[PDB]
């Protein structure tokens, strides 16, 4: 049925009886009242049972061997569903498929019942999830640490073409994958004040909030390793949250417990602008304070000289969100352990490493000093001391460079004083990395130039990657099978072996097969679109898709302009042939991001005109993919023909969706941005659809001055589109509905959409020409898939391991379960 593993006779029999066991004793049901949800749960429990054995030994192994431990701190872990992924890494997929079949059930139908663990916004969160999988697969003693939000990323509903946010109550029916561990609750402090007494500083009169951990198993690919992802939940103490006597009301006191537990209540959906809310700072300290106590406690056991701390501990900071870990490690070392400053700092720097994910200014965390002053007084004092000593180092290296001193400070003066968390991370980490070659170069040349000049050795690059298990074997078993048929299975944990596929580029059989799975994928998706969303699309057209969070820099708007152009060209010459296209755009907009929400409305408004024009027929379809999330990505990507990666050169740090499409047989049309540069470089520019300005062209335009009017004046096709928008062509009842978009495009477009319009349209024409030649299109596809091996997160993790953490990856199977 596929290399989803063997379906042993004893294995299938055992699975079946354990499924019935759980349905009865665990769910307390019987085949006569069980709903598909109960069936999903019976199965999830049966599969989960196979992890326990390995989970306990893996952890036991690390205790005995005592290897260097890697701690990945992130406020986001975009996990998605875990049932199928678990069957895959455990080689149980076929056995479970058979067993459920015999019990008279459809496994695929049950898999659709599982909720997505949406504890992330997009790329940054999903990277942590791919990393956890690769770390387990490469046998590293790694732990994922984060917050267990009861509400993850909101569920997107489109109402009247507008995005509506709805709470994601993913825990409603329970999470069979987690294991609560109250025996490990830890106390986290907030507020209070600092007392300077004889022997050191003391943080007192603090408000206490408890951190209760929940452990989720992270199984490596067929190596019997099961690592742990520990997520903290906020809990109020039963005393003072009732004990601070002297009136107020007993009832009120217990009802007010929810104020402390609000910390882990919801994931912040803000993607673009840095708000600076107090609740968010709390979430950040909460995950940091609880995690470090856990890290140090585990170290103290190992095998009190903290000199060996960096030899046993590695802490990777996923962006600046968990940056408080630096001053928090110092506080503990200096205040509680009583280490001298200098010794404590040496230790801290040697164990911390920081990862940057963007260069846009509005996203940078710059916390008001008055907030840190009230909430974390001692940390502010430690940050000031860190700054003092750091600036003393700068002054000594660049004497008299008074301006460099203010540029490099961790403290920003002005309206309100703020602490630049990124500067804090650079000063307190022994390594700082970008997520793609071009991005890492930009960090050295621009944003962190002063820091690079001070300590060049700190800056590195670690190009992002995706996990081939979830992003190929799991979502595209068909494609995975035909590949395995020719080169074997070893590539699933060694993606570089995909290169061997280059020798089949002229294979008439392979070409036919590659083209066949893609057609099957498209038919399956086209069906799902009608089943769950009733719309109907032509599976013979080119599937043009751009799925990612809605941002001005991602330029979904540039895509919209192309779509309107196509429609206008058809209306001009109705009886001329054009390659049919089904362009799908999907993604969530941050709730307070007005422009982003205006763009979602435009997309649906275009579809309302285009999808009902009789002259267009089935030649052009504009579809907005509702509620884009991980489980939905697993469906669209394998079915896409054209992947849109059109950000303004220099704005997308790396991108990972782009790597997901390349691995699944879609061709890419994009700019020389982020990882796009390395993908084209791996597959050859001839096998890529590159267009638009390069980072340098954008700069040149900026020196000169970007004037949108110039393009409006010289391109009739562009002018016509803008007039359609202004006249209400796409919004009859509300003629001025899109005045904000037109206004922005013409007067304040930071992303030069117009500047790339002409080259983008022409490039899109070359894509349509190649699609007209099935054989050649597929041959190009084979060359993209065959050279995508570099983008596996196993490669990324092996580099972090070797160049940053100081640990050697191992593909050695753990001593059975």
Which residues are the active-site residues? 357, 548-549, 554, 656, 660
- Pick from 100, 123, 83, 128: which is nearest to 39 by CA? 100
Q: Give CA angle at 89 (83, 95), nearest 5°.
A: 70
Ranges assigned E (strand) in 114-200: 117-119, 142-147, 155-159, 162-166, 179-180, 186-190, 193-196
CB of 801 to ligand BZD, least distance (A): 17
Task: Determine whether the annotation assigns residue 302 to a binding site.
Answer: yes
Size of the site for its own copies (CB under 8 A): 49
Closest distance of CB 467 from ligand PLP, Å:
11
- Residue 287: CB atoms within 10 Å: 27
Q: In sequence order, what are the residues at sequence separation of 6 or more whose Cβ sits closer than 8 angstroms to the Cβ of residue 723?
A: none
- Determine if 816 is a binding residue for its own copies (CB under 8 A): no
Q: Is there binding between residue 404 and ligand PLP (CB under 6 A)?
A: no
The residue range among 118-126, 251-259, 298-306, 312-320 that interacts with its own copies, by the rule CB under 8 A, is 251-259
Name 134's Cβ contacts closer than 8 Å, sequence gap at least 6. Answer: 465, 467, 792, 793, 794, 796, 797
Query: From the CB of 466, what's the least distance to ligand BZD, in Å?
Result: 10
Closer to ligand PLP by Cβ: residue 328 or 652: 652
Q: For residues 37 and 406, which CB has a smaller minimum distance to its own copies in the complex?
A: 37
Residue 1's binding partner, choosing from its own copies, ligand BZD, ligand PLP, none, with beta-carbon cut-off 5 to 8 A by kind?
none
Judged by beta carbon, residue 18 or residue 631, the one nearer ligand PLP is 631
Smallest distance from the beta carbon of 60 to its own copies, in angstroms?
8
Instruction: Check whether 624 is labelled as a binding-site residue.
Output: no
Sole binder of ligand PLP in the list 4, 107, 122, 800 (CB under 6 A): 122
Contact in structure between 166 and 154 (CB atoms under 8 Å): yes
Q: How far is the CB of 698 from ligand BZD (least distance, A)?
A: 17
Q: How many angstroms separate the CA atoms of 228 and 206, rounded?
A: 31
- Of the candidate spans 29-37, 70-78, 201-209, 719-727, the one that interacts with its own copies by CB under 8 A turns out to be 29-37
User: Does 677 participate in binding ligand PLP (rule CB under 6 A)?
Assistant: no
CA distances from 96 to 12, 18, 39, 110, 477 (A): 7, 11, 13, 12, 16
Looking at residue 91, the DSSP 8-state letter turns out to be: T
Residue 692 phi/psi, 5-degree rounding, is 70, 180
Site for ligand PLP contains 423 (CB under 6 A): no
384 vs 553, beta carbon nearer ligand BZD:
553
| Separation between Cα atoms, residue 43 and residue 49, nearest integer Å | 10
Under the binding rule (CB under 8 A), the answer on residue 8 touching its own copies is no
Choose, by CB under 6 A, the member of 660, 752, 779, 790 that binds ligand PLP. 660
Using CB atoms within 10 Å of the CB of residue 453, give its burial: 0 to 12 exposed, 13 to 18 middle, 19+ buried: middle
- How does DSSP assign 49-67, residue by residue? HHHHHHHHHHHHHHHHH-P
- Kindly list the residues in this chain that would bind ligand BZD in the complex (CB under 6 A): 26-28, 41, 48, 51-52, 121-124, 127, 174, 176-180, 217, 270-271, 357-358, 363, 435, 464, 652-656, 674
Per partner kind, with CB cut-offs from 5 to 8 A, the member of ligand BZD, ligand PLP, its own copies, none near residue 660 is ligand PLP
Q: Which residue sits closest to ligand BZD, CB atoms considered?
A: 123
Which one of ligand PLP, its own copies, ligand BZD, none is in contact with 124 (Cβ closer than 5 to 8 A by kind)? ligand BZD
Which of residues 283 and 787 has its CB atom nearest to its own copies in the complex? 283
Q: Comparing C-alpha atoms, which of 348, 360, 376, 132 is closest to residue 278?
A: 376
Closest CA to 671 of 650, 653, 696, 686: 650
Using the contact rule CB under 6 A, the part of the chain among 56-64, 223-231, 315-323, 650-658 near ligand PLP is: 650-658
Q: Which of 268, 354, 567, 688 binds its own copies (CB under 8 A)?
A: 268
Q: Which of these ranges, 262-270, 342-350, 362-370, 707-715, lies near its own copies under the rule CB under 8 A?
A: 262-270
541-580: contacts with ligand PLP (CB under 6 A): 548
Q: What is the DSSP string of 439-499?
A: HHHHHHHTTTHHHHHH-GGGEEE----B-TIIIIIIT-HHHHHHHHHHH-SGGGG-GGGGG
Cβ contact 653:435 at 8 Å: yes
> How far, in Å, CA of 122 to CA of 549, rounded?
7
| Distance between CA atoms of residues 100 and 57, nearest Å | 29
- Interface with ligand PLP in residues 592-631 (CB under 6 A): 628-630
- Number of residues binding to ligand PLP, judged by CB under 6 A: 12
Closest contact distance (angstroms) between CB of 579 and its own copies is 41
**CB atoms closer than 10 angstroms to residue 686:** 9
Query: Rule CB under 8 A: is residue 5 a binding residue for its own copies?
Result: no
Task: Look at residue 357 and give the partner it binds from ligand PLP, ligand BZD, its own copies, none, a contact being a CB closer than 5 to 8 Å depending on partner kind.
Answer: ligand BZD
Residue 231 in contact with residue 146, Cβ under 8 Å? Answer: yes
Q: Is 684 in the site for its own copies (CB under 8 A)?
A: no
DSSP bridge partners of 229: 144, 216
Share in percent of the chain as helix, strand, coil (round to 5): 50, 15, 35
The response to whether 30 counts as a known ligand-binding position is yes
Q: How far is the CB of 655 from ligand BZD (least distance, A)?
A: 5
Cβ atoms of residues 290 and 239 within 8 Å? no
E-strand ranges in 171-312 read 179-180, 186-190, 193-196, 201-204, 207-219, 226-235
Dihedral, CA atoms, 648, 654, 657, 663, nearest 10 degrees? Answer: 120
- Kindly indicate which of the ranges 19-27, 119-127, 593-601, 708-716 contains the residues binding ligand PLP, using the contact rule CB under 6 A: 119-127
For its own copies, the closer of residues 11 and 270 by Cβ is: 270
Q: Is 297 annotated as a binding residue?
A: yes
By the rule CB under 6 A, 123 interacts with ligand PLP: yes
Q: Is 530 exposed, middle or buried (0-12, 13-18, 19+ CB in 10 A)?
A: exposed
The number of CA neighbours under 13 Å toward the Cβ of 8 is 6
State the binding string over 654-673 for its own copies (x if CB under 8 A, else -). --------------------
State in angstroms the smallest separation of the CB of 644 from ligand BZD: 14
Q: Which does 243 bind (CB under 5 to 8 A by kind): ligand PLP, ligand BZD, its own copies, none?
A: its own copies
Q: How far is the CB of 121 from ligand PLP (least distance, A)?
A: 8
Nearest Cα to Cα of residue 612 among 510, 678, 604: 604
Nearer to ligand BZD, 149 or 203 (CB): 149
Which helix H or strand E contains 667, and what residues bound it? Answer: strand 667-670
DSSP character at residue 206: P
Contact partner, 629, from its own copies, ligand BZD, ligand PLP, none, Cβ < 5-8 Å per class: ligand PLP
Q: Is 300 annotated as a binding residue?
A: yes
* Nearest in space to 390 (alpha carbons), one of 301, 309, 330, 306: 330
The DSSP output letter for 20 is H
318 binds ligand PLP (CB under 6 A): no
Tell me: is residue 303 an annotated ligand-binding position.
Answer: yes
Annotated binding-site positions for AMP: 30, 63, 297-303
Binding site for its own copies (CB under 8 A): 24-25, 28, 30, 35, 37, 49, 52, 55-56, 60, 151, 154-155, 164-169, 172-174, 179-180, 182-183, 238-239, 241-243, 245, 250-251, 253-255, 257-258, 262, 265-266, 268-269, 277, 279, 591-592
Binding site for ligand PLP (CB under 6 A): 122-123, 126, 548, 628-630, 633, 655-657, 660
């Amino acid at each position: 049925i596929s290399v989803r593993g063997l379906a042993g006779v004893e294995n299938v029999t055992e699975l079946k009886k354990n499924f019935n066991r759980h349905l009865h004793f665990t769910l307390v049901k019987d085949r006569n009242v069980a709903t598909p949800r109960d069936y999903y749960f019976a199965l999830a429990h049966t599969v989960r049972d196979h992890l326990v054995g390995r989970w306990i030994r893996t952890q036991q192994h690390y205790y005995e061997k005592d290897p260097k431990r890697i701690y990945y701190l992130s406020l986001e872990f975009y996990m998605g569903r875990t049932l199928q992924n678990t069957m895959v890494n455990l080689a149980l997929e076929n056995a479970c498929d058979e067993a459920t079949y015999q019990l008279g059930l459809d496994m695929e139908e049950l898999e659709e019942i599982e909720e997505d663990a949406g504890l992330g916004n997009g790329g940054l969160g999903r990277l942590a999830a791919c990393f956890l999988d690769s770390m387990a697969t490469l046998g590293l003693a790694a732990y994922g640490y984060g917050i267990r939000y009861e509400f993850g990323i909101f569920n997107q509903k489109i109402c009247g073409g507008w995005q509506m946010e709805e709470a994601d109550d993913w825990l409603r029916y329970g999470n069979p994958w987690e294991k609560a561990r109250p025996e490990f609750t830890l106390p986290v402090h907030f507020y209070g004040r600092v007392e300077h007494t004889s022997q050191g500083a003391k943080w007192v009169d603090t408000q206490v909030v408890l951190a209760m951990p929940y452990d989720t198993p992270v199984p490596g690919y067929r190596n019997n390793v099961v690592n742990t992802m520990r997520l903290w939940s906020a809990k109020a103490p039963n005393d003072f949250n009732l004990k601070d006597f002297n009136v107020g009301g007993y009832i009120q006191a217990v009802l007010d417990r929810n104020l402390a537990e609000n910390i882990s209540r919801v994931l912040y959906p803000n993607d673009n602008f840095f708000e600076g809310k107090e609740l968010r700072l709390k979430q950040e300290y909460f995950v940091v304070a609880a995690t470090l106590q856990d890290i140090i406690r585990r170290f103290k056991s190992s095998k009190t000289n903290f000199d060996a701390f960096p030899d046993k501990v590695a802490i990777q900071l996923n962006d600046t969100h968990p940056s408080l870990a630096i001053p928090e490690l110092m506080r503990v070392l200096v205040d509680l352990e009583r280490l001298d400053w200098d010794k404590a700092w040496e230790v801290t720097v040697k164990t911390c490493a920081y990862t940057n994910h963007t260069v846009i200014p509005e996203a940078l965390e710059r916390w008001p000093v008055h907030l840190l002053e009230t909430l974390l007084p001692r940390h502010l004092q430690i940050i000031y001391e860190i700054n003092q000593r750091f600036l003393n180092r700068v002054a000594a290296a660049f004497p008299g460079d008074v301006d460099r001193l203010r540029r490099m400070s961790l403290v920003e003066e002005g309206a309100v004083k703020r602490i630049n968390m990124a500067h804090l991370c650079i000063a307190g980490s022994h390594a700082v990395n970008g997520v793609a070659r071009i991005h890492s170069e930009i960090l050295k040349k621009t944003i962190f130039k002063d820091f690079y000049e001070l300590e060049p050795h700190k800056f590195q690059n670690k190009t992002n990657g995706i996990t081939p298990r979830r992003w190929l074997v799991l979502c595209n078993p068909g494609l995975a099978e035909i590949i395995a048929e020719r080169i074997g299975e070893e590539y699933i944990s060694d993606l570089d072996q995909l290169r061997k596929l280059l020798s089949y580029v002229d294979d008439e059989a392979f070409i036919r097969d590659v083209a066949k799975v893609k057609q099957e994928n498209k038919l399956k998706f086209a069906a799902y679109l009608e089943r769950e969303y009733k719309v109907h699309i032509n599976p013979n057209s080119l599937f043009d898709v751009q799925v990612k969070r809605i941002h001005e820099y991602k330029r979904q708007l540039l895509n919209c302009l192309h779509v309107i152009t196509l429609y206008n060209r058809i209306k001009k010459e109705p009886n001329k042939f054009v390659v049919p296209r089904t362009v799908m755009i999907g993604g969530k907009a941050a709730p307070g991001y007005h422009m982003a929400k205006m763009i979602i409305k435009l997309i649906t408004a275009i579809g309302d005109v285009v999808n009902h024009d009789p002259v267009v027929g089935d030649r052009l379809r504009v579809i907005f993919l509702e509620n884009y999330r991980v489980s939905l990505a697993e469906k669209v990507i394998p079915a896409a023909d054209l992947s849109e990666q059109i950000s303004t050169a220099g704005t997308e740090a790396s991108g990972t969706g782009n790597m997901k499409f390349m691995l699944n047989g879609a061709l890419t049309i994009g700019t020389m941005d982020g990882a796009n540069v390395e993908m084209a470089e791996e597959a050859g520019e001839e096998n890529f659809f590159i267009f638009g300005m390069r980072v340098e062209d954008v700069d040149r335009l900026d020196q000169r001055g970007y004037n949108a009017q110039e393009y409006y004046d010289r391109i009739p096709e562009l002018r016509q589109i803008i007039e359609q928008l202004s006249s209400g062509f796409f919004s009859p009842k509300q003629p001025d509905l899109f005045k904000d978009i037109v206004n922005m495009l013409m007067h304040h477009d930071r992303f030069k959409v117009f500047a790339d319009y002409e080259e983008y349209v022409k490039c899109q024409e070359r894509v349509s020409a190649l699609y007209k030649n099935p054989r050649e299109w597929t041959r190009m596809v084979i060359r993209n898939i065959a050279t995508s091996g570099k983008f596996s997160s196993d490669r990324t993790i092996a580099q972090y391991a070797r160049e940053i953490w100081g640990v050697e990856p191992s593909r050695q199977r753990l001593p059975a379960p």
